């Protein structure tokens, strides 16, 4: 039974359909008028159970013929409207939209907000159900969208219309009807959504949000998103369109951090400041400030990092009195990594020549170059210090010094281009070591420059068959990192012809594996652009064929999250059958490169790699730890470190070596205490193996890199923006490590220095508009959305109050503690500028 | 292992996109696993341990490869130890696999005894985070400095030469979020979490109290980086019960070196705490949990009503206003009951009046007494 009022409404709804059983017009205007008013009252009300709709399970089902054949006047409109409003409850999704289309067009707000939302969803569905072969039935759907979207923007339904409009793919028309306050929600929503929607819709969504940002005059964020679109011409356009000098300086800081530099003309006001900031050369002057503002200025000793003074030195007394090569190389690498960028050392400054005299062979090419990391971005600092070795009697240390000269200039650009000048006359040096050091240093000094003078100085070395093969490999690597992702034909065609000519005995040699990377680096993040290139690559022979093609395809989709390409890479990883399988090994880092763009992608790749390790043959097994390292570079997640620990003791020596590297790589510069503990335990555990000792100590140097202020994260700007030069900087080392016995533990330790291409510190430094340092109290902590659902994600949770400057580990965010200042850019990462708030009043 | 956390909660296609991303990845897992030696080592060892193998207990180790083992029949056997058994993994009380015929020790079995503390090891912290708590910033920094920073970055204290603080008491009116904050810090640093509720350590058996606390600290130090939570410490805090206090105080301050395990103790009646248990040497960090103020109350309302569908007319300020009359738990109660009240009148979209009558009814049920 039903209550008295409920019974009255039920009886009304009943004899409102009992009467309709015939032709009389006294039903279609009057009775449908009563139905319309009652249904309007029900639906307009917030009551989530419209009472007529509860009763109307015995629906209009008898009234189909008269509904169809009646005159299309107000009677048909009324019937269609009533059946449409009711139809959201029955399974009439295909037909509710048609009922609304054939009924009175009306305004959707008249019925109810939930009705508007359901009709919007139905429009979104019918857009995809409609074929792409015609464009006439889409106009009726647009005649609903044109009013649904403004209604949603009026009613705090930003994400609804965003999704509606990406479903019909026509994002173009969100860039007109936005309010000055509602823009934040929508831009942030598509900014979050872009990482998941596939190509090319993600790029169109990006440029749509960029248009919205330009229309709301948010120039720094517009340039940030343009850098997402990695098209320097678009960045140049927005930079020219800017109207604030200080905003231009802030975005020049962002460009210098991203590693992008573009020429400036005389019309660019305050030319010197913008040019030098975008050239990043000021960084050292800032960096040595931060270091001395927290007084870490004392350079640490590799022995002290090992802290042999406290462990029980069970190798000592008689059996320690030798300056053996391997641990000396490890100590030199540790001194370089830990004391990197601090511009000073106590070991290899006072005993510079003396320490070198007690190393041997490839250590000289390494140890000397180590100094270059300590003297980072003080070009006139290192460049005054390498001279004593630029004319050294020793030749191998000369090779190391000639690379240190270039590595000092890494990350900064000088109008003079000093490294270009110094290393130009030695890129054809007769001795292989001199040429190798010169070319590696020059490539590091100009990674991401794309300038064609250096590229045309580099390219002839490809055809220079007289140069040893590793020289060709380093040349391809340098050409790749100098021109990252640009897909420039001048480089690309030349390197394609270079890789096209090698024979069987050359395709299988240790260093040829880098040449495809030199191609792939030129195609970073460009995707289907490799498809035209891939047609040529199939001409070369298997297994080197699949090796090169998979590597370049991976480079084409690095950070894209393209799950279809990841599926193809998994198929490559799934061919169960060892040199011919080396192409599978690269494929492992593939799932890293694609999935390292999203948190969910990374954390799911973590679970994939566990099973892949459980089932993998040794070629995949050794490759996995490198990809694990790249997932969380300078982000020591415990669920990664524990796996690396459990696989650091594997009987397979190469699996152990790669896990040991991944230790320092995931915790690079983080100075984590627990990881340092397991590294010390491994050092006292693997003391019987010089290889494992060297690897463990190298990892110890990696985690203590820059004493805690330095990291190798290729992403920046709230971990949404990636730096292609940094991506290459890791990628070369990680792909090289696939044969660690020959490449790194063998002849080519210097290859590790490639990570200096990714060298970027993590901190906040606040300046006033004069750009002098301005210590400001800020609120620092993790990032979550909490009460932000498809809206504002600003939440520095579990925060502390810290006066700037402060270091910012992976996942850390900072916010202005007091609103007394206004930041130039509301993304507080790296060097930021502040202004006094005039709207704020006392 | 667990799934990622999808962090839109409103029904939007962003939530969808994250989901089908996850489906893609798990489907690649399925693909990979479906698309599918050491017989010398097995033929030596796993044939020396000829099936079946019995399970017994190790009592003593006498020689390098000779040990005493008891079995479930209670008999005692001096047997040999095969070389592959990890000696450092063997100690009195350890469960050991034995050859059926000759009872020789053929390996250590990972422990499956001490059931109760094994249950209270919980480790099921991930339901909350520092995100779920709003406005307790002073408390957050205090506990971070005391327990969280020494676990995440003991480097600062070791470099400073500082032995980190080794005890924290949380206090305040109930429902202020002490338990929530403890669970949240357990979530932030993934160190093993141990919870034991107050009176539950009080036991009828004379030994069971001190014995229970001893075994709980034993398991905590066994897990090494660990946090132990004693809520309503007042039940014990305010001879036998005093002896359990003495056991806990000595486990905190006394002999041996405790190491890494941290201790959080939550009380509602801190002023009734005995002077001994509040040790200045151990308990140097006392964190008060005051009744939330206007800003904190607003934060809690947003946090709890965030997951609820809300109407436009809701004016949160009139709910926030008046005085600090109530805590966060009461706020959750208002949110829940407003949800039910909207449900009765058939709203899936709660309105302002719902919260108004909800707070009124809660204040009615809040306290009592004749005028």
């Amino acid at each position: 039974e039903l209550s008295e009022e409920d019974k009255q409404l039920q009886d009304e709804l009943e004899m409102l359909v009992e009467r309709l059983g015939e032709k009389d017009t006294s039903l279609y205007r009057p009775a449908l008028e009563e139905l319309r008013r009652q249904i309007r009252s029900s639906t307009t009300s917030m009551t989530s159970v419209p009472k007529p709709l509860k009763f109307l399970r015995p629906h209009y089902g008898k009234l189909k013929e008269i509904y169809e054949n009646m005159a299309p006047g107000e009677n048909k409109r009324f019937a269609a409207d009533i059946i449409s409003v009711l139809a959201m409850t029955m399974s009439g999704e295909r037909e509710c939209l048609k009922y609304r289309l054939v009924g009175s067009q009306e305004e959707l707000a008249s019925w109810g907000h939930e009705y508007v939302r359901h009709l919007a969803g139905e429009v979104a569905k019918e857009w995809q159900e409609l074929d792409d072969a015609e464009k006439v039935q889409r106009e009726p759907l647009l005649t609903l969208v044109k009013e649904i979207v403004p209604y949603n923007m009026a009613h705090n339904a930003e994400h609804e219309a965003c999704d509606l409009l990406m479903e019909i793919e026509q994002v173009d028309m969100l860039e007109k009807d936005i309010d000055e306050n509602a823009y934040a929600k929508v831009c942030l929503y598509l900014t979050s959504c872009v990482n998941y929607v596939p190509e090319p819709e993600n790029s169109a969504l990006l440029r749509c949000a960029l248009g919205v940002f330009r229309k709301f005059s948010r120039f720094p964020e517009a340039l940030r998103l343009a850098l997402m679109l990695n098209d320097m011409e678009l960045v140049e356009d927005i930079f020219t369109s800017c109207k604030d000098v200080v905003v231009q300086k802030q975005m020049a800081f962002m460009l210098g951090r991203h590693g992008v530099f573009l020429e400036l003309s005389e019309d660019v006001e305050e030319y010197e400041d913008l040019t030098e900031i975008m050239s990043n050369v000021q960084l050292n002057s800032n960096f040595l400030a931060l270091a001395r503002e927290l007084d870490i200025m004392e350079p640490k000793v590799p022995d002290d990092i090992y802290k042999t003074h406290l462990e029980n030195n069970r190798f000592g007394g008689s059996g320690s009195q030798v300056d053996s090569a391997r641990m000396n190389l490890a100590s030199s690498f540790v001194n370089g990594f830990v004391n990197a960028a601090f511009g000073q050392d106590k070991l290899l400054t006072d005993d510079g020549n003396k320490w070198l005299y007690k190393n041997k062979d490839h250590g000289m090419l390494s140890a000397a170059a180590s100094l270059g990391m300590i003297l980072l971005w003080d070009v006139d600092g290192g460049l005054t210090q390498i001279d004593k070795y630029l004319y050294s009697s020793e030749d191998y240390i000369k090779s190391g010094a000639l690379l240190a000269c270039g590595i000092v200039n890494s990350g900064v650009r000088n109008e003079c281009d000093p490294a270009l000048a110094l290393l130009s006359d030695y890129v054809l040096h007769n001795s292989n070591t001199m040429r190798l050091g010169s070319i590696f240093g020059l490539g590091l000094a100009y990674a991401g420059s794309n300038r064609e003078d250096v590229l045309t100085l580099l390219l002839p070395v490809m055809g220079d068959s007289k140069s040893s093969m590793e020289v060709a490999g380093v040349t391809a690597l340098a050409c790749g990192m100098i021109a990252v992702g640009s897909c420039n034909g001048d480089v690309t065609s030349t390197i394609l012809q270079t890789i096209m000519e090698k024979s069987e005995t050359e395709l299988k040699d240790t260093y040829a594996r880098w040449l495809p990377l030199g191609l792939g680096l030129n195609h970073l993040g460009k995707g289907e652009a490799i498809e035209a290139i891939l047609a040529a690559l199939e001409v070369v022979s298997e297994p080197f064929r699949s090796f090169a093609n998979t590597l370049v395809d991976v480079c084409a989709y690095a950070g894209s999250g393209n799950v279809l390409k990841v599926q193809q890479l998994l198929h490559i990883c799934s061919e169960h059958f060892a040199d011919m399988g080396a192409h599978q090994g690269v494929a492992v880092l593939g799932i890293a490169l694609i999935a390292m763009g999203e948190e969910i992608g990374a954390e799911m790749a973590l679970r994939t790699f566990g099973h892949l390790l459980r089932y993998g043959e040794p070629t995949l097994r050794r490759a996995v730890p490198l990809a694990l390292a790249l997932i969380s570079v300078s982000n020591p997640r415990l669920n990664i470190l524990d796996t690396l620990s459990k696989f650091s003791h594997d009987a397979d020596p190469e699996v152990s070596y790669n896990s040991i590297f991944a230790m320092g790589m995931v915790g690079s510069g983080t100075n984590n205490a627990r990881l340092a503990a397991m590294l010390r335990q491994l050092a006292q555990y693997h003391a019987k193996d010089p290889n494992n000792l060297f690897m463990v100590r190298l990892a110890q140097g990696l985690t203590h890199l820059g004493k805690g202020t330095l990291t190798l994260c290729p992403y920046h700007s709230d971990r949404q923006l990636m730096s292609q030069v940094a991506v290459a900087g890791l990628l070369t080392v990680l792909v090289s490590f696939l044969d660690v016995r020959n490449i790194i533990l063998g002849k080519s330790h210097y290859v590790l220095y490639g990570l200096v291409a990714a060298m970027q510190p993590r901190m906040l430094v606040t300046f006033d508009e004069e750009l002098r340092p301005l210590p400001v109290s800020v609120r620092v902590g993790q990032a979550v959305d909490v009460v932000g659902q498809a809206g504002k994600p600003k939440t520095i949770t579990g925060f502390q109050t810290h006066t700037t400057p402060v270091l910012l580990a992976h996942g850390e965010r900072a916010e202005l503690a007091t609103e007394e200042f206004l930041p130039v850019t509301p993304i507080l990462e790296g060097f930021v500028i502040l202004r006094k708030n005039p709207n704020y009043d006392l | 292992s667990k799934l990622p956390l999808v962090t839109p909660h409103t029904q939007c296609r962003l939530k969808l996109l994250k989901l089908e991303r996850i489906k893609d990845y798990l489907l690649m897992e399925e693909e990979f696993i479906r698309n599918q030696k050491q017989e010398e080592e097995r033929s030596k060892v796993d044939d020396l341990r000829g099936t079946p193998m019995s399970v017994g207990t190790l009592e003593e180790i006498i020689d390098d490869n000779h040990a005493i083992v008891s079995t479930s029949v209670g008999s005692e056997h001096y047997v040999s130890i095969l070389s592959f058994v990890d000696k450092d993994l063997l100690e009195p009380g350890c469960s050991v696999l034995l050859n059926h015929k000759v009872h020789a020790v053929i390996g250590v079995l990972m422990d499956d005894t001490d059931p109760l503390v094994t249950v209270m090891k919980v480790e099921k912290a991930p339901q909350e985070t520092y995100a779920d708590i709003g406005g307790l910033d002073n408390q957050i920094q205090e506990i971070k400095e005391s327990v969280e920073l020494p676990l995440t970055h003991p480097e600062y204290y070791e470099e400073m030469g500082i032995k980190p603080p080794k005890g924290v008491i949380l206090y305040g009116p109930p429902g202020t979020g002490k338990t929530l904050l403890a669970k949240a810090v357990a979530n932030q640093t993934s160190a093993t979490f141990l919870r034991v509720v107050g009176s539950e350590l009080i036991q009828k058996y004379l030994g069971d109290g001190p014995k229970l606390v001893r075994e709980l600290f034993r398991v905590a130090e066994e897990h090494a980086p660990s946090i132990v939570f004693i809520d309503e410490i007042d039940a014990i805090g305010t001879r036998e019960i005093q002896r359990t206090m003495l056991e806990l105080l000595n486990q905190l301050d006394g002999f041996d070196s405790r190491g890494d395990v941290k201790v959080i103790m939550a009380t509602n009646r801190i002023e009734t705490l005995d002077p001994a248990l509040i040790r200045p040497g151990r308990i140097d960090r006392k964190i008060e949990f005051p009744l939330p103020d206007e800003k904190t109350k607003k934060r809690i309302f947003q946090i709890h009503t965030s997951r609820m569908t809300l109407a436009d007319d809701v004016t949160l300020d009139d709910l926030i206003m008046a005085k600090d009359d109530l805590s966060g738990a009461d706020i959750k109660a208002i949110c829940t009951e407003a949800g039910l009240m909207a449900l009765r009148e058939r709203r899936m979209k709660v309105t302002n009046e719902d919260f108004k009558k909800s707070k009124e009814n809660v204040l009615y049920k809040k306290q009592e007494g004749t005028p």
């Binding site: 209550s3 409920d6 989530s48 159970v49 419209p50 709709l53 509860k54 399970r57 959201m88 409850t89 939930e114 939302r117 359901h118 919007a120 969803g121 139905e122 979104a124 569905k125 609804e160 | 029904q11 939007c12 296609r13 939530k15 969808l16 989901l19 089908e20 489906k23 569908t309 449900l343 009765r344 009148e345 058939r346 899936m348 979209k349």
Partner: peptide, 28 residues
């Protein structure tokens, strides 16, 4: 107020959904 009749919960959990409900619970 009358208790929630089965139709009432049905309409409560049907009318109030977004146009996404079915997809995302099925996906879960």
């Amino acid at each position: 107020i009358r208790a929630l009749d089965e139709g009432d919960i049905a309409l409560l959990k049907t009318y109030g959904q977004s146009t996404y409900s079915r997809q995302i619970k099925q996906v879960e």
